[PDB]
């Protein structure tokens, strides 16, 4: 069966063919997003039924379409004409990526900033940035893309060394115009290179590096059935692949003895965002949802061995959709392997004499994608004893700007003239729960620290307290790092061989949340990112702390109008929503290219298993 | 001629020599302590002059003793007679591991509490607890340890998963009496084994693991020459032991172009605590000073290849003194090895068309210490771009005690019967530094938020503000996990090539800090785990941040006193103290033994290189 597989080319082919034959896909149209959906609640029981979703959008300026497609039975389930002024654009265009630029490059404004400047037009290159959500009017319900202009004085150059300041531009990408062009005055275009292979920078290359050989003799430990099935270490799962939110794990349970219990039935980055912190009107609209907006799937890596992925790598190479519904694979753009995590437990024994030692391991399920500057890998781990962990490494050139003379508040120096605004990188994971089946309730945990006195003489007593998240209006909950603050998701109708709730505790790293003022058009389009945890009843059309349409889309949509519905979330199909993020002023150490910074969060068994998991593990 | 070396055997057989010669080490005096004291400030101009430290106990009954001998010359520098009543006791020495069972066996009050519970003596373990300081006034100046038993039902039995709780016992050690024993009534012993060797427990071992080889063909990138010198990827440093703090690094440096740039003059963990959250009178005068008490580093295990440290392994085999000044070898009980860390930097750009990937590593100096049921490992990293790590896995086996009928506030549940009372483990980093040499600061930085208006119209600016620590008055410092704070250490009188002074940055774990009641006892003995972090003026007599003596010392020692002087801090040679632990609340997952728990911190640099320093590693 497998309904939870990867797409195929074919399932890919077939979703063109079946709106080409529907008359939803004529030579105006581009597929903006195309994505297979998860199973029917109940399903499973019910013979399969492939279900996939589109975007579509028309470049002669007619409305888009959202689309539910069944590959299975070759029809169309619903069609619908957006109203983009009303519930947002499309995502962003691949083949957009050059339009602001070379619109551009024949307009008279721009010409005369770069002319200004003696900036050769031929040299200067214009990223594709996002627009959001501002004062012009004119922009509602147009797709509009916003310019920012960096020199590149060679093919091979990095242009990012170079950022022109003063000067941005507004662009209507499908009636092919330029709306605005803002010029604030010259700055001194930074004239160092910042190329991380050219000699002269990196001077001579270290010699006293000696390899480091990984290798398994014997294979992997875990095996791969049905494309995308993974058995390790007790561990079940499958692993998806969608061009919006890129890796996608389903169905994570746990073979504890004979039975297979689930823990997370689907788990995902849902969304992120890159808010800056810098009030020049160059740059004070930009906010990136590199997964909203721009589709971080799309533009995962090729991932080579040894390089990329160390060890003895087993590849996924998921099928996604081109602009025109033909299939085209990513090779190798999912990593898979386990590795050795240092000691697992160990004790020596002074009363009985027995010295015992154990090796941890985990499973590593990774991809890595490129958004214009950045590069962010994801990685998801599993580890022997049950924890479950997601690491974001972030990487890449840093967004330059000018330094300015006199200094900033809301930007760094890097080099000579160069600057690097403030910003946040904040991800939203997405953890549909699934703790020994549906029926899960969320409870806060604090310290709770007692006072000296009657009980409590000496005043070293200390406890805590739980409080259970009864319905969505009283699940949107702040980090207290003070007071070790965890959520706790238990199952009350499943109790451990102690008569306790099984239960996973989710252990957060308490890193600042949105910092934006909460007046702000950020603070609303990402609403998510102001709280660290929010919990919602399960819906199939829930799936993004966003919305569907994130694209110069107002607040309106995403997890404050699904948190209005206060729905009973106390021994429910529930779902976790938690932000985390890396607040980044930038340092000289990440110029020209920046070393790998990280974030995540985990959550560990809290009496899910009747004693530890780990006994039968080999010496 | 590194005056830096470990401490060699003969080094140890000359302190003994000194001792015994001037009537300091007959057939009734016990070393508690001997170490190597580290060269004075400056001393790198004269002939090496290496002096040891040893505290020296009396089993009579006469005063101790502390000494300071210089084993260069053959003589003794100072020989002082403590008043323990006043300065604090010795450290618990490691044969009266048996003192406290032994006196017990024989006492008519214990004999009774063992007879009421049907239990046999010779199957019942006393740990020797550390005592701490209460209410007992008979106890000031005498050599005190607590009695908590433990059932042992054959010799290769876990007898944690026996406590025999409502029961107490206070010893004087050097007069062999019992001053108490305290019955508050029987609770049931628990039943069930915990021998987590057991088939019976384990059911059938795993078969599924297949290998994990890692090897260096080639051998390890880093190099060691005298002896414990290190040389690795521009690092320099120098691996030092001490049986009270364990591995101690020397000498932290990193080689910038032709310049070796010191960065931490000494990093330790100066003390280490356990306080128990039970406020039952059986357990809560229970903390324990693994590190100041119990000296950890006379505990480091003997490391094997394979099963504790995996791959190219170059150990260390540090020797100690026995009680009676007898060098002692820990063989392999310091673990150095390289590991690979995953992708160090990456880039694949869309306008320059360069893909760019290198690799991570980071060398590792480890090792691992057995206290009772706990076991320990301490780690120390540093990585390719100049991040120092610390991290700490907690492993062994929970302390045990009932659990009670209707539950608990302050206990876990961890078998039928069994409980674990609520702890925490509480580390103090002592970062004596030298950020491009002695003259530093430290600065705290908090973001920034800012309000929407004048000069930030759209309400997206966010800032950072630093706060000089300019005396110690105010260099006592608490986390801020909400606002992202920091703590800057930098050299004002050194400045990069963008004219801002270097910087290393410290980041905290943020965990919560002492929860004990402030006027309790453990709060004054352990004054320093109420905050996160201290800085004080260098001074060479202060080394722990409990005091020399911290076994049934009365509170205040160590920072609170140091602090106290209010030196200034703004551009001196400066020491850093960082509280790190973790509060556990005991899991079912944490027995029969637990997995390894984590906490720790690191240092990334701030400025204090030119740009990223890893632009010359090769693919
Ligand atoms: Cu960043
Ligand atoms: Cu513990
Ligand atoms: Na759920
Ligand atoms: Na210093």
Same mark, same amino acid.
């Given at each position: 069966a497998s309904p939870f597989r990867l797409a195929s080319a074919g399932e890919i082919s077939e979703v063109q063919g079946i709106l080409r034959t529907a008359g939803?896909?004529?030579?105006?149209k581009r597929i903006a997003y195309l994505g297979v959906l998860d199973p029917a609640?109940?399903?499973?029981?019910e013979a399969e039924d492939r279900r996939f979703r589109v975007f579509i959008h028309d470049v002669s300026g007619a409305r888009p379409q959202e689309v539910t497609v069944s590959v299975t039975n070759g029809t169309v389930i619903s069609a619908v004409e957006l109203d983009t002024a009303a519930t947002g654009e499309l995502p962003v265009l691949?083949?957009?990526?050059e339009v602001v630029e070379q619109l551009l490059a024949t307009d008279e404004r721009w010409l005369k900033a770069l002319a200004a400047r003696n900036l050769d037009v031929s040299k200067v290159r214009v990223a594709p940035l996002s627009a959001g959500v501002?004062?012009?009017?004119?922009?509602?319900g147009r797709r509009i893309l916003r310019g920012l202009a960096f020199v590149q004085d060679?093919?091979?150059?990095?242009?990012?060394?170079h950022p022109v300041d003063g000067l941005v531009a507004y662009v209507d990408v499908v009636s092919k115009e330029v709306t605005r062009v803002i010029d604030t005055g010259v700055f001194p275009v930074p004239a160092?290179?910042?190329?991380?292979?050219?000699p002269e920078l990196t001077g001579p290359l270290r010699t006293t590096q000696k390899p480091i050989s990984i290798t398994q003799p014997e294979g992997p430990s875990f095996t791969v059935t049905g494309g995308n099935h993974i058995e390790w270490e007790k561990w079940s799962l499958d692993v998806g692949f969608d061009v919006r939110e890129g890796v996608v794990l389903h169905n994570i349970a746990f073979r504890d003895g004979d039975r297979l219990r689930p823990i997370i039935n689907r788990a995902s980055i849902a969304e992120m965002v890159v808010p800056y912190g810098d009030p020049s009107p160059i740059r004070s609209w930009q906010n990136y949802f590199?997964?909203?907006?721009?589709?971080v799937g799309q533009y995962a890596n090729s991932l080579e061995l040894g390089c990329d992925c160390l060890g003895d790598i087993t590849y996924l190479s998921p099928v996604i959709s081109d602009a025109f519904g033909n299939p085209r694979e990513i090779r190798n753009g999912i990593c898979m392997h386990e590795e050795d995590w240092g000691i697992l437990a160990k004790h020596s024994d002074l009363w009985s004499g027995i010295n015992y030692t154990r090796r941890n391991r985990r499973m590593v399920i990774s991809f890595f994608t490129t958004i214009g500057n950045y590069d962010y890998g994801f990685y998801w781990y599993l580890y022997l004893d049950g924890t479950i962990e997601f690491e974001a490494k972030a990487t890449g050139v840093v967004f330059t700007s000018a330094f300015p003379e006199g200094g900033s508040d809301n930007i760094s120096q890097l080099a000579p003239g160069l600057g690097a605004p403030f910003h946040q990188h904040i991800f939203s994971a997405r953890l549909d729960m $699934?703790? +020994?089946?549906?029926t899960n309730r969320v409870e806060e945990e604090d310290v709770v620290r007692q006072t000296?006195?009657?009980?409590n003489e000496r005043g070293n007593a200390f406890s805590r307290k739980r409080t259970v998240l009864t319905r969505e209006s009283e699940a949107v909950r702040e980090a207290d790092a003070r007071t070790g603050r965890t959520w706790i998701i238990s199952n009350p109708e499943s109790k451990n061989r102690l008569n306790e709730p099984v239960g996973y505790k989710l252990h957060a790293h308490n890193q600042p949340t949105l910092?934006?003022?909460?007046?702000?058009s950020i603070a609303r389009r990402?609403?998510?990112?102001?709280?660290?945890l929010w919990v919602t009843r399960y819906?199939?059309?829930?799936?993004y702390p966003t919305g569907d349409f994130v694209n110069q889309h107002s607040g309106g949509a995403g997890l404050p109008s699904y948190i $209005?519905? +206060?729905?009973?979330?106390?021994g429910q199909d529930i779902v976790v929503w938690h932000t985390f993020g890396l607040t980044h002023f930038p340092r000289?150490?990440?110029?020209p290219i920046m070393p790998v910074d990280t974030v995540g969060f985990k959550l560990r068994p809290e009496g899910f298993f009747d004693r530890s998991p780990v006994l039968d593990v080999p010496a």
């Open positions: 939803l896909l004529g030579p105006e609640r109940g399903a499973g029981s691949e083949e957009e990526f501002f004062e012009y009017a004119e922009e509602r060679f093919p091979e150059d990095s242009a990012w060394a160092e290179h910042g190329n991380y292979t050219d590199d997964t909203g907006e721009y589709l $699934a703790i +020994d089946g549906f000296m006195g009657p009980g910092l934006a003022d909460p007046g702000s990402a609403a998510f990112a102001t709280k660290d819906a199939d059309d829930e799936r $209005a519905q +206060d729905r009973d979330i106390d000289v150490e990440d110029w």
